[PDB]
Design a protein around this ligand. Structure first.
Ligand SMILES: Cn1cc(-c2cc(-c3cc(Cl)c(F)c(OCc4ccccc4Cl)c3)c(=O)n(-c3cccnc3)c2)c(=O)[nH]c1=O
Lengths: 301, 303
């Protein structure tokens, strides 16, 4: 048993991380086939960052302005192009360690693993989730731009995130591997603030089901609730509204434990009202919201 | 900024995980050079596990009782021997993906990454600590026996743990890569429980320093305690004693924040008595103790 926040084995992503240098800038790149993906703000000076004209800055760049290093091997850039906020460096060598991969855009509440990298060198891996305000609560230092988030299914690596910036509140914003930002954020040094963050309700419910599966039942009660009555209460605690889609994806966990989804919603309503009272659930003194219903069936059932 | 429970990149270890079958038992092995390491209890049946005579059981076994699958490529076992509780299986081929490595034994309070595997295929990675009662609070399902714990220094993998069994309270027991158990446990189906666990005090203090570094500062105060006054309070809440060596390694965090160690102990003592009751620190409603001072420095300042 036991239930921890497991990240995916990072081996297939480590083999793709490289260092991209342009002028005074050093950040990370993702080497897949003969393409290196990195944030397009690699081409900026600090003065550009307030209102960068990325099209104007890139057209002034030549291939030899970009220094790419994979280990002790320096790759030769033979071309470049921009796709949304991601720069794509064509190189004369395909990465022999290129795994089976594909690019995906995830939705809030979805989880993935982050391979934090510095100077193209992987340093640590951790699991996190896309927040409802489209930020992630990562751990990033200066130099970590270009780090990627991912899931691995069987042997296919689905890249879903590339790290671009840290917001003033210490939270992090980025793009998918097609250069499209998650949320209303831009790669500009102007004033940007994430909206109010909320708890991922469907993930908390899935986590309570995993608690019942592992033998924790102290929080259940004899109550039920309607869907609308639950949302009116939960939204008073800054929880995300639960939808019928969410009710449906919890069915397998409801059928495995014999506890109806709206019955577990009644338990959560009471937990929000009473707190933990010194107790814990799966070793946590608060309600965890970064385990998806999919993740629960994976590590548990 | 930000702080999360961070594991080492597991790639150098993923390339060493193989599957080991003996009869009906299936678990994981560590393939380094031309030797595959795995728990010795793989040779036991359910009736054997009740009171095993390992030297007799292994003597009556053959190289042909060991099926070793590395991905889809079979590995011929050309020899076998026991070192303590770890079975060593000589194979015909050295592992081409063998990293620079060494076997080390860790102490309670030290942390390491665990690559949980199932049928020789890596499934997930997570960071944990060797508890003071020599257990680890891991996440293991059926078939994870043989998963290893490790740290990485530069390019060198320091293997420190191999998973053997789960205890009745849901915690886990295992050995170093030389077969020596962590804690007072034996690899036999018998009645064994873990001792009263305690909180790793030096790790909590380092974690509170990481909180200060990230802007969570409400728990600070102007007061100082003594190492004797603090340890008298710590023993009452099942906290490990704070030694002078623990204060010394918190030194870098003390200088970088301006919070002397015994000031942070005054903050910790007040948190121990007055509780938290839902108020959080680094998004946690309890005191985390699975980050060493070195973990904090590596993650918060990249030193
Ligand atoms: C040259 N250079 C720069 C970086 C790098 C750039 C950034 C970064 C990227 C962009 Cl597009 C920005 F608009 C930006 O201004 C943020 C800001 C400031 C003031 C008001 C509002 C806003 Cl929004 C910052 C970064 O946030 N980080 C980072 C730091 C800590 C944790 N995580 C990410 C790092 C790098 O890694 N390597 C490298 O060579």
């Amino acid at each position: 048993s036991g239930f921890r926040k497991m990240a995916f084995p990072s081996g297939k992503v480590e083999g793709c991380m490289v260092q991209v240098i342009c002028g005074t800038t050093t950040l990370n790149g993702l080497w897949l086939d003969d393409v290196v993906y990195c944030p397009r703000h690699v081409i900026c000076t600090s003065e550009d960052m307030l209102n960068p004209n990325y099209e104007d800055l890139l057209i002034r760049k030549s291939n030899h302005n970009f220094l790419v290093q994979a280990g002790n091997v320096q790759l030769r850039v033979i071309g470049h192009s921009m796709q949304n906020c991601v720069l794509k460096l064509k190189v004369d060598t395909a990465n022999p360690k290129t795994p089976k991969y594909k690019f995906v855009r995830i939705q809030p509440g979805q989880t993935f693993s982050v391979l934090a990298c510095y100077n193209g060198s992987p340093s640590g891996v951790y699991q996190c989730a896309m927040r409802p305000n489209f930020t992630i609560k990562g751990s990033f230092l200066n130099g970590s731009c270009g780090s990627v988030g991912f899931n691995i299914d069987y042997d296919c690596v689905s890249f879903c995130y590339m790290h671009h910036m840290e917001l003033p509140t210490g939270v992090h914003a980025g793009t998918d591997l097609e250069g499209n930002f998650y949320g209303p954020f831009v790669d500009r040094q102007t004033a940007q603030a994430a909206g109010t963050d909320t708890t991922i309700t469907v993930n908390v419910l899935a986590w309570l089901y995993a608690a019942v599966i592992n033998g924790d039942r102290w929080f259940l009660n004899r109550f039920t609730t309607t869907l609308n009555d639950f949302n009116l209460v939960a939204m008073k605690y800054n929880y995300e509204p639960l939808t019928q889609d969410h009710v449906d994806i919890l069915g397998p966990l409801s059928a495995q434990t014999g506890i109806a989804v709206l019955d577990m919603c009644a338990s959560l309503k009471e937990l929000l009202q009473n707190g933990m009272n010194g107790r814990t659930i799966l070793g946590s003194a608060l309600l965890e919201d970064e385990f998806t219903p999919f993740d629960v069936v994976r590590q548990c059932s």
